[PDB]
Symmetry: C3
Subunit: 311 residues, 3 copies
């Protein structure tokens, strides 16, 4: 039976029941990945990757997912220089060409809106691996799955979203999906200059999600099941050096922060990180960001299976 989605492009394609069913499949994929026996679920299928921006986690997890299921991969790892995009070929022409060689396309473009255009052009499934600074739906899926896996529930949780909330596609998209669950509380922890935009705030309010803004990470972290960290780039302060200095050292996950957190809470980060999570934190079992990346393998295995062979 076919998967109801023809492409995986944006968070709004998913409802709670679909998320639960996908997560069920991802748990089965964990069993497959831990086995000694090579799976042949996707034997005979080919994935074409089209990476127009750099990637470590999303590119390698999709390729590993395909090969762990017995499929194969045709990679284009830097499309703007190594493909005929370098000769001016449009996205739509690239898609209509590559679909002749493959059964599914995984694309990370440089412009928001590209993934939807690719899906509309292609007659094979497309997965958005990051749409420039826009949607990154499989990151949001693996983030929610990781919370469920680590905490054991999604209803009734408290999540701190930390860092560049105004511009951060990962925190915005995670908030969007968490709103499909019940009794969720979200804390928006950031300097005022990069606070969460009103579109997400209004959506959470309409969805019955309680939310609170704070600039006090130490206070918030003691009350949360999940601290989900992102960086605030220096450039986001613009010429306001005063605000950069006022925020300095206040939005970092360090050993002192772990000291106020609950024993069963976790630290998440979509990666890559820089110094906004210190290396000491890594030694704590609650540091979940590498387990989170591994969960992307299982989620992407699930999606490849569903899009290519269905339920």
């Amino acid at each position: 039976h076919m998967f109801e989605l023809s492409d995986v492009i944006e968070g709004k394609q998913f409802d709670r029941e679909m998320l639960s069913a996908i997560f069920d499949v991802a748990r089965e994929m964990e069993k497959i990945e831990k086995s000694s026996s090579q799976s042949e679920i996707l034997k005979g299928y080919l994935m074409a990757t089209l990476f127009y921006e750099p990637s470590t986690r999303t590119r390698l997890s999709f390729e590993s997912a395909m090969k762990r299921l017995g499929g194969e991969v045709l990679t284009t790892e830097n499309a703007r220089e190594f493909s005929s995009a370098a000769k001016g070929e449009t996205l739509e022409d690239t898609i209509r060409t590559v679909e002749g060689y493959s059964d599914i396309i995984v694309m990370r473009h440089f412009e928001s809106g590209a993934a939807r255009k690719a899906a509309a052009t292609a007659n094979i499934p497309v997965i958005n691996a990051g749409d420039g600074p826009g949607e990154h739906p499989t990151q949001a899926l693996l983030d929610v799955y990781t919370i469920q896996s680590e905490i054991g529930k999604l209803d009734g949780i408290s999540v701190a979203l930390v860092g560049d909330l105004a511009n951060g596609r990962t925190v915005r998209s995670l908030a969007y999906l968490l709103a499909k669950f019940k009794d969720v509380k979200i804390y928006f922890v950031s300097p005022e200059i990069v606070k969460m935009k009103d579109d997400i705030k209004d959506y959470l309010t309409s969805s019955g999600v309680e939310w609170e803004e704070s600039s006090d990470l130490m206070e918030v972290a003691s009350k949360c099941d999940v601290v989900y960290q992102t960086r605030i780039q220096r450039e986001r302060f613009g010429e306001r050096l005063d605000l950069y200095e006022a925020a300095r050292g206040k939005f970092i996950v360090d050993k002192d922060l772990l000291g106020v957190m609950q024993k069963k809470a976790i630290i998440m980060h979509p990666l890559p990180r820089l110094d906004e999570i210190t290396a000491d934190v890594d030694a704590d079992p609650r540091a979940a960001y590498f387990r989170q990346a591994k969960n992307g393998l299982f989620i992407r295995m699930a999606l490849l299976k569903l899009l290519l062979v269905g339920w």
Copy 2:
């Protein structure tokens, strides 16, 4: 069963009519394999090494897909100038001798004409020329002729328009060369005056029994042809005269008005990539064949890999 008569695929002149027709029959067999649900194991155990010194979408990915659709594997070198030890200064001959130690067939797109021939002479395994700088692109010519046969139903007795920079055009020259292997073919040359087809092709066509005609009226030509083969006007060929490039670029466009004069079962081809020389409108017409053409490259390259590695 017998050995393929070619040890390498380097240039159009290696092919005669009989060989072309036989390869096209193998390509039709490969289309049946590619459509099947069962994974082929014809090339299980064989390894292809790619060596791409210039960018590619169609040629690189179709060869890799062809190999994997037949059950073989691929070792890719996707930007050889930068990430291979050619970046350290290595000669082509040393690269080829090295890579043959790891692989069973080499597919190479170089930037210098004559590289493919030098690679075949060095290697003791088959080499396929995936484009040779200003030189030949033989598998493109094979897939072009195959596409005409598949779309029109015949090669003898067809009319083909070749459009663009004909003076420097690699694909139009090689297509003309192979079409001359068939009978009662007529070719129309449509180009800006500055980049007309060179005399070497004109004389070969007349010598080979192909009628040809130059025209500056694409609307008149297109109404009389089974195939309109469009190409991209490229800046590099105009040297330090950007003004001449811009003048040439606008002249011969395949647009809705041109499709409106074409025959009901004619086709538009283009080796790709295109810029604006085929408008987006044309894509909506069933006669726009350039994406089917690219797909046919998969079947042709499957056929060549099979023939070169395991024979007829």
Copy 3:
């Protein structure tokens, strides 16, 4: 039983008995590679490559080795620009990410010491494919295998190491392995600016290996079993292109040099070469550098097999 090494990082990890046993495995891998049947020894296993500097032989021989054994490969063939290392990600974060997708990591880095750091971080085997101008243990293994194959002995051999010794991660690791044999003599022949570094000299002296510096390549070549030529390592000279050009052209293997060498002696070179072996040498049966590179396939097959499935 399990292989006694958990990673292949440094020449000093190998003792004489281990080298002889690895060479026996490599001979079995040669039989596999020459056979018409596809091996499935490593079916189900995935190798991740991480190449932060260019490579032809090391990269392709490892990938070919893995596929010839029936495994699969996830490539990052330009990690500095095409992975998230371009965004500042530390090596330790890259390793902990990639290990979630793979069973073994093969890494070439531009910084000496990187492979040992990776091994200390990863809970899967790591193979050093070259760590800056530091070491290159698998080149050293294939080099010693080649000497044994071509000369028929390692004890009592005389080896000339020629060219850029200072920066030559090849000759550094090779020196470490040659010291495991008896009655060896090594000649160092180089421009003064790139003479062998003191760490290697001190190690050979402490191991009882005779060594001698000389600037007379014709004299040295006439009395050696092996003349091991190298490329002047331009990428290690930084901005000192004056010193780079001064170091070239001083020591050339040409027909005149072969004319003074013994009939049983060989020329080796890890490759690529530029001008330092003339093309007319290639026709001489003693020119062993292409056989050497082929032997790398068998040695790397052996290491992948041993690290993943044991003896």
